[model samples]
Target: HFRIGVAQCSDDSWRHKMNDEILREAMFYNGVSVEIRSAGDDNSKQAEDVHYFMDEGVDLLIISANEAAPMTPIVEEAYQKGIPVILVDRKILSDKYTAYIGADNYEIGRSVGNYIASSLKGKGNIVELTGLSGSTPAMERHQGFMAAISKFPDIKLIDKADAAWERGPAEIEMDSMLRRHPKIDAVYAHNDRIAPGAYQAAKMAGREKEMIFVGIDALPGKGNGLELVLDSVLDATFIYPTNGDKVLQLAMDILEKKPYPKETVMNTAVVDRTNAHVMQLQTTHISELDKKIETLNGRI
Candidate 1:
């Protein structure tokens, strides 16, 4: 049996949770055994996890780095040692990994920027709450967002804060922003989970209805972005594809010596109130199907 080692970045947020679920399903369906570890947003811990997997003699390694730069050397070492490595959602500085499966985070950020500009009619003061400063997604998304909004001089990005993709920190940052910026038109969060914290802060300050909210990573299920959109908590959210199943599939292909691409970029979309319900229903169906599959596997 093929043994896979998965080194995940953190436990916070819906994106990580959904990735874990999909990875578990993919491994089980393919009858592959896996050793999974979460680094809890620590760069050093993630590096240690990679070394632990290598020491355990895993057939393949998968990584979603907490900090892209710090994780590069370990990922490169694994690849140079002839172990197939797949990167999901995030990447190291090098192209040493065998394959990468994830949405173009920069494009996703740019799309959100365009949407925000259009929604505000190219005239508004906005605050941006970024994710982990050291991660690749945060940097790429910020670059894209800035590029898209650069043409709209009237749409000013007045303030920016780094929440590191956690709800509490996002709340604290938003609270501070709200107090400092009285005429803000909108708030853009790096992810849906962070968006809610900002929303709560706005609600507490009684400014929730005065400004619009936008975010990325529209993951489905309880407390995720889709439900928030349906409930009118967030004005819109961009779907950030997890690409978990695809990553595992590519790992298997590499191990089996099958032809595969070195990189795969998944597509994303903006979801709002108009289509949020449909997306939620589709997600529910998928969850049910996944449960049935798990039951069958257990029976066998």
Candidate 2:
């Protein structure tokens, strides 16, 4: 009779997949009752969700942080109240939570650095479309990327801007950066959402062909990262598994008073032209509507 609470981010495309598909699948797979709430990317709203969960006396709290630092107080408060907390996809302050799970964002950033370094032969003027500034992934990825680039003096980040992990803001940021720097050789977007913004901007400005747009969170499937490569929207991307299943599994375990890791790191791989299609196929799952539409589309 334990109630589990799951707090996710906004209503974006990725969040839709994570909340609707992954979370739904997990609920079926585990047979546990959960109250899933979303914060719409507002820090205060997420804190309020946590408070509400606490008030309801939920046994376990699973959180996908919107912004890392701001969520710290809420997470710590929950921990102090003796509630078992599982942090998914991002870190809380001081690692006070019982479990943390998701992809290694810093490593993803390192991969980006290596790719840019080798592709540009350790020399290029790059612009970074940063994620939500205060989020753990943004901070870690940006720092890790910079650490990798520091090894080569010729490679530099010409300018950077926070895109809030969405396409529209990133596109506008890229447009401004493009105007400021006439010779940008590469663009690094923290996630695929932002990558498309940069792509749209670059395409409109006639710079898409000349600039290498790289991204992270290249989830497999037609509309995600790999498809962007096939569709020619992005030059390259790193696949970061959402660990959706693992999160649910751990949530169930915590609710049942079982032991799990303090932090769980999901796996990822680099996706480019060679195996991009395969990656897309692996990540594609058909909904009833999608199956119907796809069947109809195939006839055309």
Candidate 3:
């Protein structure tokens, strides 16, 4: 028997997608248990979540760190105590862990940059709506995006503001930026949530149609990344797959003393006009099937 503890950073739409995979994948296993807790995006709260899991003597400690720097010592404590730690979604500052299951934020961001370059026809002014400052994804995405765009001398990154991964905060920041950068071309948000908020700010100025928008975390649901693309809310979004099933699989391999990679990189894709409709259709169908499967699982 084994006990698995999952410490998610927040309860946002994207994090909920990860939880869906985690719980849905859990059905196939026997003699195993999982307890998930959210830290409400608080660094100290996340640390306490891990501490509580450690106190409960969980077999595995899975955490998507709220802040890389502050989460390091707490996760390090678990690792030093011989607990197998799986860093999910986001990683801590140190490498004192067993495995990592998440996307390459830097590479994904680079891909977005390349996509943006082409979408804007290689020459345009863009403003970045960034995530929380201390988060790894936010920082990595920024670096990768800058790297990709830097090659295009004509494309300029004019201004950016930190939104702390919230739509309201993003709207406020974009409102200010819109006032200053009246001739903006596109909005590059760190996540889908910010994209809509940024768009709202633009919309309020009656300039939404003048600029293009793109984001990350193309989750499958109403008003999510995929839907935003389909509804013309965002020009494009990158697929930051949750792959929760892969996460659990990796954890099981580690727990059962089986061979597994120390790092499992989740794949990413771009969902724009060309494929947004198809992606949404397929994901919705798959979700319905998943529900049926769950029903059958419950019946038996």
Candidate 4:
């Protein structure tokens, strides 16, 4: 039995679900034992956790970081100590990691932006519901989205809010924003969790259809973003590949000591009414997500 350690930056239940899905699928395929831990969104705690894992002599270290730079030293320390580090969902500042696996956050944002741009015919007010202030996914998604929608001078984000990546914060922020910017024609949420919040806020204000709501982090199966699109709660969602299986595969390969790309770009797809139902049917096949997205046409 090989000892593997899994470290994440948050205590959010979704994060744990993602960990469980990946490890469960990995064990089903490889029958290897793995240990999991969390940093509870604390960067310092994550650094200490890495040291603890290293001292314990784990075979592999997998982390979904809290802060890109703050987590750098610990990842480097793990490398120096000869412990291979596999990064998931987020990456550190250095290249010393064994492998990196996550979705194309920037690409997901761009897709959503472009969709909104075209759907609105490039002339509408957009409101942005962002994730945690400084996380890489939040920054990348914001930058990518702005870049994509920038071409249409008519499409503009008139206001923004920080949702902290939870439905309560997202809805609360959106509720206030709607009261202030009710004329907005489009709403862009950084993740699906935020979508529900924004949608509920818009519904309460009676502006649901007035703003075409878009979000990211489309997890697979019942409670994921696709369900929102299928039910018309959200106009569109970008599939944020929760690369759990990929992380496990990479970890086991390193344990067995095999060749694999150091950086793995988990594929993403757009979800909307056109194909959410069909996409829901194939949630288990991680490899087929891209193909399903191709038929979605960015989900207007």
**Tens digit of per-residue lDDT, candidate 4, span 179-253:** 887598988999888889989988998889787889887666566677778788888888776657667888878
> Which segments of model 2 are wrong by more than 4 Å?
25-31, 284-300
How large an RMSD does model 4 have? 6.7
Q: lDDT of candidate 1?
A: 0.87
Task: State the lDDT of candidate 3 residue by residue for 102-186, as single tens digits.
Answer: 9899998899899889989999999999999899999999999999999999999999999988899999999999999878999
Q: What lDDT does the true structure give each of the candidates?
A: 0.87, 0.82, 0.91, 0.81
> How far in Å is the alpha carbon of 272 misplaced in model 4?
0.3
How close is every model to the real structure, measured as TM-score? Answer: 0.95, 0.90, 0.98, 0.88
Q: Which candidate, 1 or 4, has the higher lDDT?
A: 1
- TM-score: which is higher, 1 or 4? 1
- Residue 46's lDDT in candidate 1: 88
RMSD of each: 1.6, 4.5, 0.9, 6.7
Candidates ranked, most accurate by lDDT first: 3, 1, 2, 4
Alpha carbon deviation, residue 26, candidate 4 (Å): 3.7
Which ranking of candidates, highest TM-score first? 3, 1, 2, 4
The local lDDT score (0 to 100) that residue 124 gets in candidate 4 is 92
**Residue clash pairs of candidate 1:** none
TM-score of candidate 1 on Cα atoms, chains taken together:
0.95
Error (Å) of candidate 1 at residue 49 is: 0.6
Tens-place lDDT digits, model 2, residues 1-300: 557788886666666666654445453543566788989889999999999999999888888888877988889999999998888787766778888888888888888998899999988899999999888889989988998999999998999999999999999999999898999999999999999999989889988888898998776555777778888788889877765667777877776667777778888788888887666565554345556654664574
